[PDB]
Amino acid sequence: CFEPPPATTTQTGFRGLSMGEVLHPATVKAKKERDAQYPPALAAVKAEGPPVSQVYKNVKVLGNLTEAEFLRTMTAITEWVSPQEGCTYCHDENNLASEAKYPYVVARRMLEMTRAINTNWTQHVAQTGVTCYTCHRGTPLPPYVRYLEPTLPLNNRETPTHVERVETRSGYVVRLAKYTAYSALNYDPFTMFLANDKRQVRVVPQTALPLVGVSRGKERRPLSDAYATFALMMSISDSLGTNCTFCHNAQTFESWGKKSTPQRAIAWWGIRMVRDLNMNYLAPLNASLPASRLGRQGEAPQADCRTCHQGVTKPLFGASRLKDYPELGPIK
Amino acid sequence: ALLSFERKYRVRGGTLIGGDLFDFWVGPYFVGFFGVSAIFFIFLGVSLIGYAASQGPTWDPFAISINPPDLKYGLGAAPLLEGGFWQAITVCALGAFISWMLREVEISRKLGIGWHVPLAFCVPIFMFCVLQVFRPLLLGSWGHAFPYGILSHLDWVNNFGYQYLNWHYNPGHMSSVSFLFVNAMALGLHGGLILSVANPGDGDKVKTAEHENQYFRDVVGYSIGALSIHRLGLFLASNIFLTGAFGTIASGPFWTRGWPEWWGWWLDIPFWS
Amino acid sequence: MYHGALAQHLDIAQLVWYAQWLVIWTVVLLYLRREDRREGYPLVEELPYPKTFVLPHGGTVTVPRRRPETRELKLAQTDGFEGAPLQPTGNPLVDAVGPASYAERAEVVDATVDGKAKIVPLRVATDFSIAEGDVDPRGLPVVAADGVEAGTVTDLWVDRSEHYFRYLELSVAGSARTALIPLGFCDVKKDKIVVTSILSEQFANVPRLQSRDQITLREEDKVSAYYAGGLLYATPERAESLL
Amino acid sequence: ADYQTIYTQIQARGPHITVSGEWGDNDRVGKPFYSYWLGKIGDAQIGPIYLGASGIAAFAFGSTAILIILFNMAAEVHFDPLQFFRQFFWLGLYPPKAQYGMGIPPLHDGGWWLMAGLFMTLSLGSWWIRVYSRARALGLGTHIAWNFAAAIFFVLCIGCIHPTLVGSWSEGVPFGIWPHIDWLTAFSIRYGNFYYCPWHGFSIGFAYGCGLLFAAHGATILAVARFGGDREIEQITDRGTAVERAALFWRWTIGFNATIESVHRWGWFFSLMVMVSASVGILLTGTFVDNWYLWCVKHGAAPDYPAYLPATPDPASLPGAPK
Ligand code: BCB
Ligand code: BCB
Ligand code: BCB
Ligand SMILES: C/C=C1\c2cc3[nH]c4c(c3C)C(=O)[C@H](C(=O)OC)c4c3nc(cc4[nH]c(cc(n2)[C@@H]1C)c(C(C)=O)c4C)[C@@H](C)[C@@H]3CCC(=O)OC/C=C(\C)CCC[C@H](C)CCC[C@H](C)CCCC(C)C
Ligand SMILES: CC(C)=CCC/C(C)=C/CC/C(C)=C/CC/C(C)=C/CC/C(C)=C/CC/C(C)=C/CC/C(C)=C/CC1=C(C)C(=O)c2ccccc2C1=O
Ligand code: HEM
Ligand code: HEM
Ligand code: HEM
């Protein structure tokens, strides 16, 4: 009902604009204690020895690394992906080279993905970077995943109610509003923006006057595009535990420069990164994952904003393991 | 200089303080003690506004803006050009509003009438205090309040409205808007009804108070009356800020998330979730 | 090519912006402010055509008003200034000056839609009665501002057009007469009628009615203003500053 | 302080008054009943009520308009009555999603929305006749009808007129509690911030102005209720001490004053310009203005603030950046 005083607030614009984050000191401290569960880096190993390409039977990505570094990598991977089962979740106990189980082939595709984010998408991740834990958080299935339709609850670990289930058609708006931060926007921002590069987010014209040949009849973009942009931004703001002012001067949402904060550019690179992972990486693996993991339309669970962030402007409060594990990007 | 009936009403007495010393008229304006203080508050304010505007980038009325200090300054004293100007105009504004009310109290006592008008002006003063003094106090800085500019204060409401995702969903704002629309609608109904009876058109007779009561009984079925309409009109106008004062103050100190998310006491009840 | 882009750097939205401020100031300055001047003019100590209203019960009356006889005001100036206040020369309650001043209304009894006298007592209005739940003031004493029983309410005066009580008829103690008072000056109690406006020794000078069973608009102003004067003129302390 | 202004201390009761009109004196339906508690803050009598050929038709077109939306609200919660009461606020009827232009939208996509709005138009249209004819039957001015006409004039500007000008039925206002709330943001976004529209600025000024006027006038009449300031009809034709004290309060406060009748013209014109200025804004919105912020920048009305956080260029304009 109410969040008890006081409240921690910041400044993101010129004084008097009321720009900045509005945060509750109990909610954030509940988020830090969840994010502090980040497993610390493993001890430094010996760099002297032959690369694992000559040593082992089936290694195609981490082939340059030594046996000491490779085992360390696999010990770290288990601590972030499948610690409740262990090595045997993705391996056969007698054969570590064979690809008899499904979490092996997906893992190798996820490795090329994680390396790519810390090598190519550094405009977003910078020197902080991301690991396996940033999304998985010590579970094989990432808590926050998205299908081709809105689902509840956001965290899939939670036991859902009958109405919140995607099967019951009576609670569609319930699944629709919660993803758009409790708003009755009849638009899914994931399937229209976050999944593919089919739709342009920007809906506001850069001209003071309407150009002739675009502002009359079928030439016009429907108002639904302005709704969905607003529906996307709500999903964006709720996933980072912040508001518009963090990236916008509400005076003008379309303009960049003094009206935009250095984080809006990062957010833009966030949109372009999510799509590339969804399309090139998180879409073709539907044949790699079983029929149980799939949704309803034969699609694989894809990522968005909250997948790493989980309710904070930065995933895990600026925690970096990039230097600790150079095998996850950037790649030379 | 006076109305054809004013002379007999212009008498000594009615002042709260000052006595006979301030009791007189400047043209049509009455002064009193609070007339002197008000003018002083208005004078010193505009003078410092005229001093801050020459220290600004432009002279365009739409663009003229004087802003509060940074949030890191807190509720302490801020430098003149760094929100200090704003800190002086606020006190000057408050004093000008407070003294103007008490001046209207000094006028109401002289005419032997009710105290309803200066008591109705306490509401917009109260709402000015919520935005500029009350809500900033609970947070901990003077910078949260709005700047004094024609177009600049619109951008403050914009960001502050957007800080909690969607402001329409605010329960205090909902009722605030509800009373803003219902008061304007009633003034269109009341203002139109009085002119309809008095002016039937052409060479027709001015109707009676029974015709007032007959019209609404024929249109909607229920009439409030001739005295009660001015009571509700005052009620519907006051409750714009009365309900609005609780929507603004909750945003921040009592609620940090978005206001659509506040509607989670109804939807997520275990038995229909 | 832009929709609305005409000559120069101007646009259609800019032109209407001027046309918007055009019609407003025209309605405000050339009409609304002129209608504000139909009462209280000319200036003592731009004008509109004096408007005409056809009365509900035969006849007409033009605004503003010009009366055949003047009312002398028994007041004297405090000082030689133009906006200088005026001071009562005698008793302001009977002379009707300041808050005790009544307007120059017509001396006719107010009328309903059917013509009948609007403000009448319950002795003329027999079909009218007090609602169940509220107090019947007939037979309850009237205690004045000084805490003294000034009289006793004998009947109630009702508006026959709106179904609403307006006046309380009470026979003044030690006067043998009846004096009227608007309900606005009264605090209704179950045992008493509370009036803080005037002293008990001032209940006898309340403007007297021409008829016992009917009241005119001017008489409705004389009575209402009389108690309004007492707010500032009942005790020698009600005229000076509070603090 | 006056107690009669707070509440009716003693309420008056009697036989009800029936003012004969030109037509329809037998069309009055309802046995009059009286409430004691409502009589404290107003009039006790509730009823009777007139129907007429203009009143029943409006209920006929109105109910049909409401039946369409309520049936579309139940279809979203899959006929579930328990989920209909839980999600009622979020539920609503929406315009066409994809772009079709000015042709008739498909049943499932803005088709029922157009029909619900069509029965809405005839409902408000037939009610205006009820607002107009009742004044003409009782020998009054048509002031209330004209104030209602401007109110109707604004609804159609955001209902059918603006969609006709630009050429898209998707521009319209959806039905529902939150869905119509969501439109106010989606329409302010498309045309570059509605704060920089002068006519939005005017309408707000008149919307606030009606609040100021009614808080003043409402308190003013209550202040002179002891003199008979509530009897406004007899105060215009015959200037009483009530309106004399009412006019002299403001003259000594602000410098000038209205009359008893003219201040109602002030309250009516302010009410009228909440709808007139709002209509002109929407008419210019889309037809002659694409962005309202850039319009105040084009003319130089808009103010500018220094960058607290480093100025942020558009990453889309970078050489080789993804589209
Ligand atoms: C981003 C935009 C949102 C927003 C953000 C917002 C915020 C942040 C706040 C409001 C508030 C309010 N909004 Mg809202 N809003 C409103 C209307 C309203 C009001 C009902 C309400 C109260 C305004 C107020 O507090 O004035 C205050 C007026 C004051 C203080 C005037 C002081 C008077 C002073 C004493 C006298 C001045 C004297 C002068 C100096 C002398 C001048 C003399 C000259 C002539 C010489 C409507 C009708 C809509 C529609 C149609 O959508 C809407 C949408 C939005 N609002 C958007 C969703 N709104 C307020 C509220 O209470 O809601 C919770 C509020 O705080
Ligand atoms: C959420 C509520 C906020 C809000 C959001 C808001 C919006 C969205 C819009 C306005 C608009 C307006 N606001 Mg504003 N506002 C303003 C000023 C103004 C006016 C320029 C204008 C018309 C409002 C009106 O008609 O009122 C009733 C008063 C009347 C009719 C008397 C005339 C007063 C005159 C218009 C005010 C002139 C002020 C001058 C700049 C003079 C400054 C004083 C000098 C001597 C130093 C003041 C001075 C205050 C104070 C004292 O608190 C205030 C409170 C607020 N505004 C709240 C903080 N305001 C409208 C506008 O046109 O802005 C561009 C508009 O669209
Ligand atoms: C993101 C949000 C923005 C926004 C979006 C917005 C839009 C899109 C529009 C407005 C408009 C307006 N805004 Mg704004 N707004 C306003 C207030 C206002 C109003 C002055 C004005 C007209 C609203 C109105 O009176 O319609 C309420 C009254 C109505 C709708 C009349 C209803 C009467 C009807 C005939 C009766 C119908 C009821 C029947 C019983 C039902 C029968 C139907 C049946 C058959 C189903 C304030 C005070 C603020 C502040 C404080 O910032 C604000 C900020 C914003 N607005 C934000 C910047 N606003 C309107 C405007 O002025 O146009 C330019 C407008 O179109
Ligand atoms: C229920 C509440 C409603 C309501 C009610 C009533 N309203 C009343 C009364 C009642 C009863 C009167 O008694 C009194 C009056 O006289 O009758 C006209 C008054 C008044 N309401 C005014 C403005 C008004 N009403 C607003 C809102 C509502 N009214 C709501 C709807 C708004 C909005 C919405 O913003 C405004 C701007 C003034 C005209 C007048 C103050 C005069 C004054 O106090 O003089 C003394 C003060 C001055 C002359 C100015 C002082 C100079 C300072 C130092 C410099 C200015 C600094 C400033 C802070 C900078 C900001 C500018 C920037 C934003 C650009
Ligand atoms: C010369 C000098 C400085 C002397 C010193 C004395 C002194 C302190 C003077 C004060 C000087 C100052 C600051 C003056 C400025 C006063 C102000 C704030 C003026 C604002 C003017 C504006 C823009 C007003 C807009 C409000 C508006 C729409 C008004 C028009 C409608 C009117 C007049 C309403 C008032 C009014 C109401 C409300 C009634 O109910 C009523 C009932 C019966 C008869 C008359 C009336 C009546 O006139
Ligand atoms: C600490 C426990 C683990 C150990 C000791 C371990 C050990 C090994 C070994 C020895 C190989 C090479 C086998 C060969 O070809 O000869 C290998 C390959 C591989 N294993 Fe593991 N493993 C562990 C856990 C995991 C987990 C949890 C995953 C999946 C998340 C995984 C996925 C893979 C992949 C993708 C390869 C291919 C190497 C490459 O090309 O990068 N393993 N592992
Ligand atoms: C719900 C609150 C928000 C609203 C209403 C909002 C508003 C908007 C609007 C209307 C646009 C489109 C303007 C145009 O046409 O160019 C936009 C663009 C953008 N905003 Fe927001 N904003 C919000 C929150 C955020 C947040 C929290 C971020 C940062 C994480 C952000 C980052 C961006 C970016 C990157 C774009 C460019 C879109 C693109 O080109 O792909 N916004 N915003
Ligand atoms: C479209 C979806 C996303 C958006 C709009 C978004 C937005 C943002 C924004 C605005 C920041 C700046 C925070 C700050 O510096 O204070 C940020 C930082 C960050 N994001 Fe995202 N995010 C999204 C999804 C993701 C995903 C999928 C990942 C994982 C690859 C991710 C990883 C990170 C990391 C590691 C940082 C911190 C880097 C730094 O130090 O600035 N985000 N994001």
Ligand SMILES: CC(C)=CCC/C(C)=C/C=C/C(C)=C/C=C/C(C)=C/C=C\C=C(C)\C=C\C=C(/C)CC/C=C(\C)CCCC(C)C
């Ligand atoms: C070529 C021709 C055929 C096309 C042109 C037709 C035409 C003129 C179309 C114009 C359509 C129009 C005017 C559309 C306007 C839509 C607008 C402005 C909608 C705005 C607001 C809608 C709102 C607030 C929704 C209200 C709905 C509800 C409150 C829901 C349910 C109703 C109730 C709960 C009240 C029932 C009462 C109950 C207690 C018995």
Ligand SMILES: [Fe+2]
């Ligand atoms: Fe009135």
